[PDB]
Amino acid sequence: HHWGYGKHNGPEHWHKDFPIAKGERQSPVDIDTHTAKYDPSLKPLSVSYDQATSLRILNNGHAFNVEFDDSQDKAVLKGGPLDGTYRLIQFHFHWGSLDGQGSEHTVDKKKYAAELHLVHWNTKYGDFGKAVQQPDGLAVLGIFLKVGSAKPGLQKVVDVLDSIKTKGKSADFTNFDPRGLLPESLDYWTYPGSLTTPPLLECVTWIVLKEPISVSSEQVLKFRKLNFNGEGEPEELMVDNWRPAQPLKNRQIKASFK
């Protein structure tokens, strides 16, 4: 009886195995745009993905992860609210059963169709596993998806999903350029939080871009054909793999822009 997104093992149950679920810096949160304060001391984000080397795509039973070779200092996030350099390890999405829901963060309670997370680890901790044990170990860049025009840079991801339908399937996925998933603007909100799935570790500086990307209805429909289950198990569509907004508690959301 492992965690997931259903009635019996979903977000409202997670605290039993992972008590930090009710902790002081849980994610996601609602971003109240009027209360978020402009912080003129924040720097522009530096997203340097020119040398990013993707390796593989994996259905892990909750989402699909596009994994990167992080053995060298290549694809890095720095600047913004961050001290030091954070290395890209994977990206993944959260999405809905319908276009009206799917994002984890919300903006004045608005839910987007999906949300992309580019996960990076602080190089001062040497590797990913050690970084998640630290309060500044990860930086996750969050990008909202709305349904409209297709995102051409997403289609290579969409087309490989047929080959990783079920939990535990992976496929080679080289030479994928994550710069094709970014909006024009790097205006962002930032706050201290957590992983949004178990083990819910409070190790993340969240950087959430204001500008959504547009993807087509057909692109997101293909996300919804994936399966939570393994091959030869009852088919459970991989939809609504988002955690709802959590209490903000004693935190401030800062804006990079006026």
Ligand SMILES: C[C@@]12CCC[C@H]1[C@@H]1CCc3cc(OS(N)(=O)=O)ccc3[C@H]1CC2
């Ligand atoms: C803690 C860990 C090692 C043991 C288990 C591992 C978890 C699994 C769940 C998870 C979900 C995420 O999604 S998100 N949405 O927070 O970016 C991002 C990262 C991890 C990793 C990080 C590394």
Ligand SMILES: [Zn+2]
């Ligand atoms: Zn995520």
